[PDB]
Amino acid sequence: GTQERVNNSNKKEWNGMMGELLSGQADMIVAPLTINNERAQYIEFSKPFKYQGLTILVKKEIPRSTLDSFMQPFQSTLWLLVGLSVHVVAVMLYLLDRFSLSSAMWFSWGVLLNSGIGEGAPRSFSARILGMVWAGFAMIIVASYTANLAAFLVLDRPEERITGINDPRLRNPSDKFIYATVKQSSVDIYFRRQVELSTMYRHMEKHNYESAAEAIQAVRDNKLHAFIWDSAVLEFEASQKCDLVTTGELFFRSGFGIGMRKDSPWKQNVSLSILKSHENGFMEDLDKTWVRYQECDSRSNAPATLTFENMAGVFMLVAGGIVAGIFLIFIEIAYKRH
Amino acid sequence: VICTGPNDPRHTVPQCCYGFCIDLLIKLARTMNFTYEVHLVADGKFGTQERVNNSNKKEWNGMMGELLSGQADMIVAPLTINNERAQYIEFSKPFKY
Amino acid sequence: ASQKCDLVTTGELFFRSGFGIGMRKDSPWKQNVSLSILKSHENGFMEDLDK
Amino acid sequence: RSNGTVSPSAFLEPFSADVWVMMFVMLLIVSAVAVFVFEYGPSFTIGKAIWLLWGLVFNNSVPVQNPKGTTSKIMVSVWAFFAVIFLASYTANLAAFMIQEEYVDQVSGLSDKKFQRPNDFSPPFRFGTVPNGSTERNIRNNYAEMHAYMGKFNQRGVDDALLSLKTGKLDAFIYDAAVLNYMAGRDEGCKLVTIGSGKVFASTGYGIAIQKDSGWKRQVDLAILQLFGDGEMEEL
Amino acid sequence: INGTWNGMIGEVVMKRAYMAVGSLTINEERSEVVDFSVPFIETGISVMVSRSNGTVSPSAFLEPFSADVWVMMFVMLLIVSAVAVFVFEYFFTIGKAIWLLWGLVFNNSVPVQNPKGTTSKIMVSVWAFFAVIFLASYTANLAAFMIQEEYVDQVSGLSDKKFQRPNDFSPPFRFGTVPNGSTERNIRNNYAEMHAYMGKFNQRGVDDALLSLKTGKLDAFIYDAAVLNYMAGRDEGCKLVTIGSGKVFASTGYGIAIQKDSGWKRQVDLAILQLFGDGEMEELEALWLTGICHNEKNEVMSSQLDIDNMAGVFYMLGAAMALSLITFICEHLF
Ligand SMILES: O=C(O)[C@H]1CN(CCCP(=O)(O)O)CCN1
Ligand SMILES: O=C(O)[C@H]1CN(CCCP(=O)(O)O)CCN1
Ligand SMILES: [Mg+2]
């Protein structure tokens, strides 16, 4: 229900449930109907039977790991520098040993990484100090790589979701956020009547849907970004389907009531019945039977797990090394025979 | 510039004072011909409106009180411009926002 | 907070105002003083004083 | 409010099961390839190579005997590089997994076994309320077992109930929603929390009492509705 | 122009209007025909720049442990090695023990020769546990230090070496402003060399200057403080940054133009001062003069490592190589 011009005459009239009740086609409105000033000037509302507010729906996309390859922490320049430095150190160690071979290269490789095959240690004092410094440098490099990877993983979190109605992303509409509505309800009236909300109302006017179900379905897909329908319905939808969540806090407190005409001999009796039902516990039973039950709860966003993205690169390199070894075994055997 | 005012003995020992306000005052004096005689506020407070133990009579204190009484002709100091003080004295264009 | 190394001015600015020269009402100096202040601001004397 | 610890299985969180199985298959394939390549006192065996690879994977702590082959050394070096990368990634992921926040039990509210069947549970839930009030009469009229159970937890005084809850002498305090919210908004720290507004039993509101048939009722109701619609209610 | 005025000032002077409410700047020449009330907003000449990542730390690798801790660890290692060698002798040289301890500290990256005995084995185990603890602590502290924030260039309000003599820097500073305006005239009147240098950059239009700054073809944009502040908060992100309000040049404000002798000047001044004191000015500024990124805080970024980041470690390796060469040359004689 909402007051609008007929586009044909200068007389404005209600539409929907409010119009039907005023037109005399119905004597009561038993359905979710928020109590507001605009609709209270024409009909009579009984005492609320369900207190609620306004919330926002969110898709809550599952987190994913941004890491792509094991070379992310170090640029190719650093890899080349270390590759050349290991050879330089091996050559220097070999020269020092000779003056005062593959053994030096094996030792350098086994000290840099943890191969454990670089047997043979230098005996000269200078060679000993060089080996100690090389081991320290390798340890520092490994520690720095691990620390950088840990820092990157810790600081890898999904973008923050909307928090309430005061979020700057909502106050400044763009071409990405939608946050549509039903296009004819208490929400539309509330957003139109607001003084410092013209931008939001103008942005939502071009994307409002026709029913709550369509808006929820669009939100479940990638066509809609947010929904501001209500709280008693959004919470139930989130509980039933944990694919969506409710964000923010209620910003328009109201309640559902029974709509009736101004001159109706049922207002007092209906209000007393509602109060008695609230007091005795009938409303609690109804809520437990129809609302107070869920299927899947919610879980605070936890750190992501390394998927096959981590495998990509590392196992590719392992396979490449195996292929290179299989290709070079024949060449090595031929060279040994020759 | 010579700078006469109290210390801590209520004697008015003349010290010497300088700084941003002194430089601005010197520049203003150079621009418009007029001599000056700087002195410190005896109370030592910027100024506010307070009551008295006697009957309720409005009165200022500090630099504002000294200027209103007539012991001074101009105030050269970090004095903020507000509605309360603007109803009695006149402020120039701000020299520091 | 620039010559202590242990004090920090944390927060945003509120109640923005400015420093002015106070005089008595009906004084033959307000207009000239304000003009001098504006001229100093435009020329750059205030920048030199601040530096 | 509680704190929350780390899950017992968190040590397996960093890597998915598929990653572990792929790593095991790759290790087996590498060991077989090395054994085959070794053909071209300490006789080499497939089991010895598998043991060496397994030991060198984690931290090559266990003693092993390196192969005498040429390409075997290159294979071992590549495996060691892969193992170091894997260990660094696992440590980083485990460090990232240790950041955990607080949580709330999220009680349904006067509708779960906690307030209905405490005996068939851990040590019985200690929930109480201030006696001699409307809440006690409402509970007695609507429930009997809960009232009898709570009769032994009569916490006299809102401040006394809060102190008992803080010290652990009580598990839950049943009272008025507005008063509980106001107290939770001023308690030391943030230990005390209140249930969600959507799970309140016997909901009602605060209003203005007028004459039996006064004509100002409609005007007052319209003014209150206008205040609600404008948005001054949130500011207040 | 041609003696007569124009626009709002001209209309107010011509007597067809009493006040001119809007974004009117207060200046000395404009105050000789009309009277200006107390400004309700401050403005001046401001410079807009772009945010820089700034996540480099050549000495970060030494941050986890202080020099005193390192020296104490070295002395403890020497003492432990000496005690172990003495115990082994009592029941193979000192050099072998020190080499073994060094290898143990660095995750046993070298094939050291283990000693024989029981007390020596116990001491080696204790040292291994200590080394494990030390390595774990060092790695944890290094990981903690790897978190870096984003900083903003410090400019002393158009009084930096980058603005007075940009030629000194190899990548000379490129600062520009819109010509044919008050800012260009003020800069030319105040400074001569700076104006001549900036003449090469004459970007026209605020949007063009913003696009140039975002792309990188420009280093700084000099304009009005209020306009720059408004544009900063309505940018796609937080790249654009304006210097603090305390470093603006030629400070002034926006006021209300009134006739010379009107009698409303005092009333309007008092009303504006009351508005300032009560607090409605802050609410108005938040409602109107505030963007998404206006109140944004410095985010935390985790950048990777490059050659310049690894500075010091390579320098340490080079110094060690030079020391080894020097010792080899010296000991070659005896
Ligand atoms: O009914 C009222 O007039 C007051 C009294 N209420 C006290 C409720 C006491 P209990 O929780 O029922 O024991 C507080 C606000 N409403
Ligand atoms: O003077 C005024 O009344 C207006 C005009 N201003 C434009 C300044 C143009 P430039 O940067 O000096 O080239 C904006 C607000 N004040
Ligand atoms: Mg090892």
Query: Cα–Cα distances in Å, from D174 out to D145, D164, D171, D184?
Result: 15, 13, 10, 13
E231 CA to centre of ligand 2 in angstroms: 15
Q: Which two tokens stand for residue D44?
A: 């080499």
> Strand pairing partners for E249?
E45
Chains B and C are touching, with contact defined as 3 or more CB–CB pairs separated by less than 8 Å: yes
CA-closest residue to ligand 1 atom 3: D206
For residues B34 and C24, give the distance between their C-alpha atoms in angstroms, rounded to a whole number.
17
In angstroms, the CA A111 to CA D39 distance is 28
Contact E28 C39 (CB under 8 A): yes
Cβ neighbours of B31 in C, within 8 Å: 36
Cα dist from D110 to A48, A53, A231, D114, E46, whole Å: 21, 22, 21, 8, 62
Answer yes or no: is A146 a known binding residue.
Answer: no
Reduced to 3 states, what is the DSSP secondary structure of residue A13? strand
Nearest CA distance, B72 vs chain E (angstrom): 23
Phi, psi angles (nearest 5°) of residue B65: -65, -40
Joined tokens for residue E233: 């908060």
Residue D70 one-letter amino acid = T
On chain B, the residues whose CB falls within 8 A of the CB of C37 are: 92-95
Longest dimension (CA), chain C: 47
Report which of A206, A188, A210, A207 is spatially closest to residue A197, judged by C-alpha positions: A188
Nearest by CB to residue A305, choosing from D13, D95, D200, is D13
Contact A70/A314 with Cβ under 8 angstroms? yes
Which ligand is closest in space to the CA of residue D130?
1
Q: Is B59 helix (H, G, I), strand (E, B) or coil?
A: strand
Chain breaks in chain B following residues, C–N > 2.5 Å? 8
Which structure tokens are listed for E2?
A: 């041609």
C-alpha closest to that of A180 among A154, A200, A159, A153 = A200
Question: Which residues are CB-contacts of E270 (< 8 A; sequence separation ≥ 6)?
Answer: B83, B86, B87
**Rounded alpha-carbon distances, angstroms, from residue E169 to A130, C41, E163, E172:** 40, 31, 11, 5
Tell me the C-alpha distance between D16 and D11, whole Å.
11
Alpha helices, H only, chain B: 20-31, 62-69, 83-86
- Residue among E150, E139, E62 nearest A151 (CA): E139
DSSP strand pairing (E35-36 vs E249-258)? antiparallel
Name beta bridge partners: B3: B15
Query: For residues E16 and E10, what is the distance between their CA atoms, to the nearest angstrom?
Result: 9
Q: Are A121 and E287 within 8 A, CB to CB?
A: no
Q: Report the C-alpha gap between E142 and A259 in whole angstroms.
A: 67
CB atoms within 10 A of CB E262: 14
Residue type, E60: A
Contact A226, A177 (CB under 8 A): yes
Beta bridge partners of A194: none
The CA distance from B23 to the nearest CA of chain C, in Å, is 8
**Count of residues in chain D:** 236
Ligand 2 contact via E182 beta carbon (within 6 Å): yes
3-state secondary structure of B75: strand
Q: What distance in Å separates the CA atoms of residue D228 and residue D217, rounded to the nearest whole number?
A: 17
CA–CA dist A307, A65 (Å, integer): 8
Q: Do B and A count as touching (3 or more CB pairs closer than 8 A)?
A: no
Q: Which two tokens stand for residue E86?
A: 């003495």
The CB of E181 under 6 Å from ligand 2? The reply is: yes
Residue E139's identity, in one-letter code, is: T
Residue A193: both structure tokens together: 């009547």
155-184 in chain E: CB under 8 A from chain C: 157, 159
- What would the two tokens of residue D77 be? 């070096």
Are A311 and D19 in contact by the 8 Å Cβ rule? The answer is: yes
Nearest one of B82, D173, A317 to E273, comparing CA atoms:
B82
Q: Is E153 exposed, middle or buried (0-12, 13-18, 19+ CB in 10 A)?
A: middle
Ligand 1, residues at Cβ distance < 6 Å: D 130, 133-136, 175-176
**Concatenated DSSP letters of chain D:** -------GGGGGSSB-HHHHHHHHHHHHHHHHHHHHHHT------HHHHHHHHHHHHHT--S-----S-HHHHHHHHHHHHHHHHHHHHHHHHHHHHT-----------SSSHHHH--SSSSS---EE--SSSHHHHHHHHH-SHHHHHHTT----SHHHHHHHHHHTS-SEE---HHHHHHHHTTSSTT------GGG-SS---------SS-THHHHHHHHHHHHHHHTHHHH-
Q: Test B87 with E253 for CB contact under 8 angstroms.
A: no
- The dihedral over CA atoms of D218, D224, D228, D229, expressed in degrees to the nearest 10, equals 40
Q: Are strands E35-36 and A245-247 parallel, antiparallel or unpaired?
A: unpaired
- Tell me whether A266 touches chain E (CB under 8 Å): no
Of A54, A281, A301, A308, which Cα lies nearest the Cα of A185? A54
Cα C34 to chain center, whole Å? 12
- Which residue carries 């432990």 as its tokens? E80
In whole angstroms, give the CA distance from residue E292 to residue E299: 14
Cα separation of A162 and A168, whole Å? 9
> Which residues in B have their CB inside 8 Å of a CB on E?
81-84, 86-87, 93-94, 96-97
- Tokens matching residue B52: 């008295």
Residue of C nearest to B19 (CA): C49
Q: What are phi and psi of E305, to 5 degrees?
A: -115, 150
Task: Give bridge partners of residue A50 from the DSSP assignment.
Answer: A256
Alpha helix stretches (DSSP H) within chain A: 17-23, 37-40, 76-99, 102-112, 125-154, 168-171, 186-193, 198-205, 212-220, 232-240, 267-280, 282-290, 308-337
- A230 CA to centre of own chain: 21
Q: Which of E24, E182, E229 to mutate to test the pocket of ligand 2 (most atoms within 8 A of CB)?
A: E182
Quote the ligand 1 centre to A282 CA distance (angstroms).
21
Name beta bridge partners: A260: A44
DSSP type of residue A109: H
- In chain C, residues with a C-beta closer than 8 Å to the C-beta of B88 are 25
SS (H, E, C) A246-294: EECCCCCCEEECCEECCCCCCHHHHHHHHHHHHHHCHHHHHHHHHCCCC
Q: Which residue of E has its CA nearest to A120?
A: E111
| Structure tokens belonging to residue A57 | 């729906």
CB within 8 Å: B86 and E276: no
Query: Using CA atoms, how far apart are residues E306 and A73, in angstroms rounded to an integer?
Result: 9
- As given in the structure block, the two tokens for residue A331 are 């060449």
Residues 6+ apart with CB under 8 A from A137: E313, E316, E317
Judged by CB atoms closer than 8 Å, whether chains meet at E277 and B87 is answered as: no
Q: Using the 8-state DSSP alphabet, how is residue A161 labeled? A: P
What lies within 8 Å, CB to CB, of A209 at 6+ separation is: A180, A181, A182, A183, A215, A218
CA distance E30 to A191: 44
Q: Is A73 on the interface with E (CB under 8 A)?
A: yes
Structure tokens belonging to residue E235: 């940018």
Residue of chain E whose Cα is closest to the Cα of C45 = E250
Contacts of A154 in chain D (CB under 8 A): 95-96, 99
Residues 6+ apart with CB under 8 A from E328: A96, A99, A100, A124, A126
D27 to chain A: nearest residue by CA?
A318
What gap in Å lies between CA E95 and CA E113, rounded to an integer? 11
Widest CA span of chain A, in angstroms? 115
Residue B47's alpha-carbon distances to A129, B62, B65, B66, E279, in angstroms, are 74, 4, 7, 9, 22
- C47/E159 touch (CB, cutoff 8 Å), yes or no: yes
Nearest-Cα residue of chain E relative to residue B91: E38
State the nearest Cα–Cα gap between B89 and chain E, in angstroms: 12
Pocket probe mutation, ligand 1, options D132, D134, D142, max atoms within 8 Å of Cβ: D134
Resolution limit, Å: 3.3
Return the closest-CA partner of residue A313 out of A65, A66, A69, A76: A69
Query: What's the angle, vertex CA D211, arms to CA D210 and CA D212, rounded to 5?
Result: 120
Closest by CA to E244, choosing from E163, E155, E184, is E155
CA distances from C39 to A144, B27, B77, B95, E251 (A): 59, 12, 19, 11, 11
Q: Say how far residue B96 (Cα) sits from the centre of its chain.
A: 17
Residue A281 at interface with chain E, using a CB cutoff of 8 Å: no
Nearest ligand to the C-alpha atom of residue E43: 2
Nearest to C38 among E28, E157, E186 (CB): E28
Report yes or no: D228 at the A interface, CB cutoff 8 Å: yes
CA angle E55, E60, E65 (to 5 degrees): 150
The three state secondary structure string of chain E is CCCCCCHHHHHHHCCCCCEEEEEEECCCHHHHCCEECCCCEEEEEEEEEECECCCCCCCHHHCCCCHHHHHHHHHHHHHHHHHHHHHHHHCCCHHHHHHHHHHHHCCCCCCCCCCCCCHHHHHHHHHHHHHHHHHHHHHHHHHHHCCEECECCCCCCCCCHHHHCHHHCCCCCCEECCCCCHHHHHHHHHCCHHHHHHCCCCCCCHHHHHHHHHHCCCCEEEEEHHHHHHHHCCCCCCCEEECCHHHCEEEEEEEEEECCCCCCHHHHHHHHHHHHHHCHHHHHHHHHCCCCCCCCCCCEECCCECCCCCCCHHHHHHHHHHHHHHHHHHHCCC
Nearest ligand 2 atom to the CA of E186 is 12
Residue B89, SS3 per DSSP: strand
